[PDB]
Amino acid sequence: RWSPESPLQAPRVLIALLARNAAHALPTTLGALERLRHPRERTALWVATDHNMDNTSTVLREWLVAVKSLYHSVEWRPAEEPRSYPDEEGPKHWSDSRYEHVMKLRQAALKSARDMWADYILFVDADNLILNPDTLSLLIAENKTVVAPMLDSRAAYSNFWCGMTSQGYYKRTPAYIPIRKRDRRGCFAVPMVHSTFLIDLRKAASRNLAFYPPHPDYTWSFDDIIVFAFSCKQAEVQMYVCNKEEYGFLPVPLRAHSTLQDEAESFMHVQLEVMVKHPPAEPSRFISAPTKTPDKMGFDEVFMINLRRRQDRRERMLRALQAQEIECRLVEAVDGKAMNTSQVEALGIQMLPGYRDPYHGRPLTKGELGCFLSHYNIWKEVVDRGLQKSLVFEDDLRFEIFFKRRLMNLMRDVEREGLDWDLIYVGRKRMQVEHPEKAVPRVRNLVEADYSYWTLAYVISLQGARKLLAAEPLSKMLPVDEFLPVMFDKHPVSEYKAHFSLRNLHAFSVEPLLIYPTHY
Amino acid sequence: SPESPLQAPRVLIALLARNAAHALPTTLGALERLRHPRERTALWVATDHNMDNTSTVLREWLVAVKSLYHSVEWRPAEEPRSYPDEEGPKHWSDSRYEHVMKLRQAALKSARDMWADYILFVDADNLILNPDTLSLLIAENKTVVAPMLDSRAAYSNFWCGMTSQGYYKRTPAYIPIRKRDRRGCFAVPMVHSTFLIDLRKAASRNLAFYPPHPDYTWSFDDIIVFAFSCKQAEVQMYVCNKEEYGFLPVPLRAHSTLQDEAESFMHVQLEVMVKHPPAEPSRFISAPTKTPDKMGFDEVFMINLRRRQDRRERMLRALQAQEIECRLVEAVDGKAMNTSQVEALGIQMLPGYRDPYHGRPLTKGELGCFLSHYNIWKEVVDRGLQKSLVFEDDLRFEIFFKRRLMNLMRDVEREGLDWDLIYVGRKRMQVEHPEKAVPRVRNLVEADYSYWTLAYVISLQGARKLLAAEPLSKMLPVDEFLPVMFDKHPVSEYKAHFSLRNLHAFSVEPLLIYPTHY
Numbered sequence A: 001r002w003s004p005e006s007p008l009q010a011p012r013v014l015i016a017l018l019a020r021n022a023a024h025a026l027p028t029t030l031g032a033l034e035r036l037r038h039p040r041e042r043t044a045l046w047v048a049t050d051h052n053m054d055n056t057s058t059v060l061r062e063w064l065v066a067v068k069s070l071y072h073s074v075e076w077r078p079a080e081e082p083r084s085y086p087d088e089e090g091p092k093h094w095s096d097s098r099y100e101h102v103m104k105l106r107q108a109a110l111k112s113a114r115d116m117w118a119d120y121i122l123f124v125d126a127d128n129l130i131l132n133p134d135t136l137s138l139l140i141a142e143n144k145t146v147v148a149p150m151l152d153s154r155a156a157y158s159n160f161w162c163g164m165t166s167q168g169y170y171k172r173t174p175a176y177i178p179i180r181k182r183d184r185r186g187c188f189a190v191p192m193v194h195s196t197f198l199i200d201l202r203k204a205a206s207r208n209l210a211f212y213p214p215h216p217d218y219t220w221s222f223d224d225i226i227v228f229a230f231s232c233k234q235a236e237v238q239m240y241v242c243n244k245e246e247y248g249f250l251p252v253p254l255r256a257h258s259t260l261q262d263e264a265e266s267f268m269h270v271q272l273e274v275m276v277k278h279p280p281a282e283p284s285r286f287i288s289a290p291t292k293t294p295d296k297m298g299f300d301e302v303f304m305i306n307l308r309r310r311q312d313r314r315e316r317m318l319r320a321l322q323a324q325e326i327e328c329r330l331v332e333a334v335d336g337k338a339m340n341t342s343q344v345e346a347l348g349i350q351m352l353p354g355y356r357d358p359y360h361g362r363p364l365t366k367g368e369l370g371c372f373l374s375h376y377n378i379w380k381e382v383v384d385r386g387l388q389k390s391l392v393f394e395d396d397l398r399f400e401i402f403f404k405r406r407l408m409n410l411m412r413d414v415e416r417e418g419l420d421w422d423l424i425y426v427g428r429k430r431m432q433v434e435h436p437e438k439a440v441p442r443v444r445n446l447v448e449a450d451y452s453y454w455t456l457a458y459v460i461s462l463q464g465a466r467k468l469l470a471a472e473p474l475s476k477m478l479p480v481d482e483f484l485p486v487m488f489d490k491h492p493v494s495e496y497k498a499h500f501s502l503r504n505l506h507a508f509s510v511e512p513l514l515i516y517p518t519h520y
Numbered sequence B: 001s002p003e004s005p006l007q008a009p010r011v012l013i014a015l016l017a018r019n020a021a022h023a024l025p026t027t028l029g030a031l032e033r034l035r036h037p038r039e040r041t042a043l044w045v046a047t048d049h050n051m052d053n054t055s056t057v058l059r060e061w062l063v064a065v066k067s068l069y070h071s072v073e074w075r076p077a078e079e080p081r082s083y084p085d086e087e088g089p090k091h092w093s094d095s096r097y098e099h100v101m102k103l104r105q106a107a108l109k110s111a112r113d114m115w116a117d118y119i120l121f122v123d124a125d126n127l128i129l130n131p132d133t134l135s136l137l138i139a140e141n142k143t144v145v146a147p148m149l150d151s152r153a154a155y156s157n158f159w160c161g162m163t164s165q166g167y168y169k170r171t172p173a174y175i176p177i178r179k180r181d182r183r184g185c186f187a188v189p190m191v192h193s194t195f196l197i198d199l200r201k202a203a204s205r206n207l208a209f210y211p212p213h214p215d216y217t218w219s220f221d222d223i224i225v226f227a228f229s230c231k232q233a234e235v236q237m238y239v240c241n242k243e244e245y246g247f248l249p250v251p252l253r254a255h256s257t258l259q260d261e262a263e264s265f266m267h268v269q270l271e272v273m274v275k276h277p278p279a280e281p282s283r284f285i286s287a288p289t290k291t292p293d294k295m296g297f298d299e300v301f302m303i304n305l306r307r308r309q310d311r312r313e314r315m316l317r318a319l320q321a322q323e324i325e326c327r328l329v330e331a332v333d334g335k336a337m338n339t340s341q342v343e344a345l346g347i348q349m350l351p352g353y354r355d356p357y358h359g360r361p362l363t364k365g366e367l368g369c370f371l372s373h374y375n376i377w378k379e380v381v382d383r384g385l386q387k388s389l390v391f392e393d394d395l396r397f398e399i400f401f402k403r404r405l406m407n408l409m410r411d412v413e414r415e416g417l418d419w420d421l422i423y424v425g426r427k428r429m430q431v432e433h434p435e436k437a438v439p440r441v442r443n444l445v446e447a448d449y450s451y452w453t454l455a456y457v458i459s460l461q462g463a464r465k466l467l468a469a470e471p472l473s474k475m476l477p478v479d480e481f482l483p484v485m486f487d488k489h490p491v492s493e494y495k496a497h498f499s500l501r502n503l504h505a506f507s508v509e510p511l512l513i514y515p516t517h518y
């Protein structure tokens, strides 16, 4: 008698989470873990927290109380005091006592996973955003003993090394950049993975892995990720990292003497990166992130040019600003194509005679016409309202880490040196690279702007806005990203600089650039 | 870059023990020796309503083995020692049925809560000889599968039919499965006692030992409730008989006794030693020492060729387990006698005998076999042994052999019966009609034509009658010489050579001893 058997239940996974000073990330992080597409009855939670200066243990307690019932079992290990290690130089410093405790904690979770007869233990760092809900399944599918998903960061940094130095140090190899950029996809044998990775406790070799104490043959630095990575060579467990698709993101780790506000803003920049091509990462339905309140960053006005039909750029940029606690006046761009040639003459507009595209030798486009007129209207509004220092934004740009603090301090430095300035490039395309641009003395992170090529974001002074309107550019219309290099007299073509008599613009660029385009 | 092997699946062995002290050294010994990794095994043990030291045996075993297993759960309950609504230790009152169903549901919840792959139920008196039974059952990849355990009778731990009312039902499938005629894993409506549940299967979630299913309307019986639970879960119960897995005592009536159980499980140990080495106990439990006696006979003999050590040790083991003590009579090797030593004894064959099957004359083995029985006959007369019991060395003891044989001799001597010979093991030849009953003495018949010498009781008056005929001059095979002496041999030529055939011979009925190999 043939009789069909019912399906096998999903593998049993223990999600082990260590949390110290992570209240900034838990709404986005724990919310992602809830929504993992793995049956919660085949999932268990293991949570350890201590040495907190923020309200990390409170947020965890409330999340766990909220989801305790959906899971197979929950383990809760808080420790309110002490709030910091007796041998630390700061919270972002990795002392040996901190290295030891975290090693003991991951061993504790590992033993905890073994004792409950789980199939897998998945480690997730508290600021590791596992955006893809299928990540756990895809990692279980590769059938590796220790496999990790390649999480994306703002820099080359990711949760894996391609080389190692026979003394445990990091090592570049030709394979890193290809894997990191998803040019080669697959699951690659690597000497080091960390942050988030999946251990398959079904494999016999997993019985020989340990996070603490180090292997008897260990002879390297007291460093948690090195100790575990060495446990894998001795167990002959090969570590793998996969990038076959996107899984999640993570912030670049700070230095020892970094602050918590550094870390908080770093994870906020992670949320920005996600929004470059994804919807904003949603929080848990039981945890709320604290209300933020924006400001103008000390400028007199913050503009953002946006064409009304570009709705999604608008919503993205306003989300990107809200999270940075930045507020702006939205300025509706002039649709150049919507201008019949009658309305073009009604404003006295004529192209700069004999203008050709620097790459296709073509005339001024209706699109560039509207772009110029949008900035021109902002210059007109600057003079009307007498705005001393205004910040101008276009609507398709990605922000650097610590954008607000880094910009507010250059303005404070420029002011304390009383620098006579008209225009400060916050984002541009530096066309003069063969020798460094002339550093501006006494003002850190500021150079004299040579030939540039964009208008993504700049700071304009009321003096500068007068100098630009003064040139009467409407009659000699030129792409605004070239009208400016003409005005600070660094444009290459001399024929163009002839049509403008008084080219007296003090133009400086922020160095390095704080704003880049989304698409490149 | 190769991946390491997967660990063995995770099994929880659930063990409900009540009044099992007679079995646990043997049963637990079998379990602790299963070929399946101990780290991939967990123990769940619950005991209560004990009248024997079951609690102490399990505790003694658990304390020893605890440190080798993934986990040990342990649920003892010393008081009360018996159910308030019971009629005896072998009575299954509703309170017992309810408590047992709850303990199995308790184990099923335990196996689930600990993320086990399988829960294995083994009753405390189920002997799992085959160490591969657990691995073999896991391999069949079923959701509820039981190994077919062997019993002394047609009983086993499965049914082939179940009525619309939940009652047992015979089908033509049962006997071939039971005898290992068909060897597979067969879908059946009932398995119990020892079976394996696959907790990896989504359907195993719907299984429950207690409470009964909402649609349940049958008797408040534990095995029925679980069987109906699989039905509602659309889980097919299977039983496999591909090889031998283990043995199992036949259950007893409600008004049965603890000693009936202890001796009935000893018969499993006996049935095991028929074709296997004896079933060893756990190396962490000591079995209770046994004090052998003589059963009231003046002597108990056991004929054994000195060369046949295998037979000797087996019989000695079988006798010790039954608390019976014997006098080993080294047999007479009829083949080792050169013709001159045959003549020294003055032995002539009965002129004309030929085997009723292949027609050969009397053999050398049949000679020494007669001389061994003959030499014991002399020793009964020598020592004045009123009643003695004679054993050969290749015979299979029935259940309750000791008490049943003692009780017969007791009814015999109470009725003052003029007896000479009592077959305990034989081959009955007259089978057309029943042999004659001996009034006022149950389980005893006047022996007609018989044809074996496995086991028999003999009296001093009988030992004299045999030696009186002086058979060494007219020697038949010893098993034909007796039906001559009590005047039933079909060959009147053979009965002619014996002038006086006055022997009073009887037979236990049914027989208490049978041959091992046929």
Ligand SMILES: O=c1ccn([C@@H]2O[C@H](COP(=O)(O)OP(=O)(O)O[C@H]3O[C@H](CO)[C@H](O)[C@H](O)[C@H]3O)[C@@H](O)[C@H]2O)c(=O)[nH]1
Pocket: A017, A018, A019, A020, A021, A022, A048, A049, A050, A051, A094, A098, A101, A102, A124, A125, A126, A127, A194, A195, A196, A224, A225, A251, A252, A253, A254
């Ligand atoms: O005393 C502590 C220190 C850290 N953590 C937790 O352990 C994880 C460490 O995260 P961090 O952001 O603080 O660490 P980094 O971003 O600096 O990157 C880390 O990546 C590895 C983590 O897998 C190693 O911890 C490595 O030493 C370290 O550089 C976090 O989940 C943190 O919350 C604790 O529970 N208790």
Ligand SMILES: O=c1ccn([C@@H]2O[C@H](COP(=O)(O)OP(=O)(O)O[C@H]3O[C@H](CO)[C@H](O)[C@H](O)[C@H]3O)[C@@H](O)[C@H]2O)c(=O)[nH]1
Pocket: B016, B017, B018, B019, B020, B046, B047, B048, B049, B092, B096, B099, B100, B122, B123, B124, B125, B192, B193, B222, B223, B249, B250, B251, B252
């Ligand atoms: O109060 C109790 C009653 C019983 N048991 C245990 O239950 C198992 C089965 O009981 P028995 O072996 O004494 O009874 P049976 O030999 O007759 O076989 C059983 O066959 C099925 C096996 O489950 C059913 O349990 C059925 O009720 C019962 O007859 C035994 O291991 C016994 O130790 C307990 O632990 N506590």
Ligand SMILES: [Ca+2]
Pocket: A125, A127, A128, A250, A251, A253
């Ligand atoms: Ca981190």
Ligand SMILES: [Ca+2]
Pocket: B123, B125, B126, B249, B251
């Ligand atoms: Ca039984």
Ligand SMILES: [Cl-]
Pocket: A257
């Ligand atoms: Cl420093």
Ligand SMILES: [Cl-]
Pocket: none
């Ligand atoms: Cl310092």
Ligand SMILES: [Cl-]
Pocket: none
């Ligand atoms: Cl320093």
Ligand SMILES: [Cl-]
Pocket: B062, B063, B066, B072, B074
């Ligand atoms: Cl114990």
Ligand SMILES: [Cl-]
Pocket: B153, B154, B178, B179
């Ligand atoms: Cl049979």
Ligand SMILES: [Cl-]
Pocket: B168
């Ligand atoms: Cl039955």
Ligand code: NA
Pocket: A257
């Ligand atoms: Na420092």
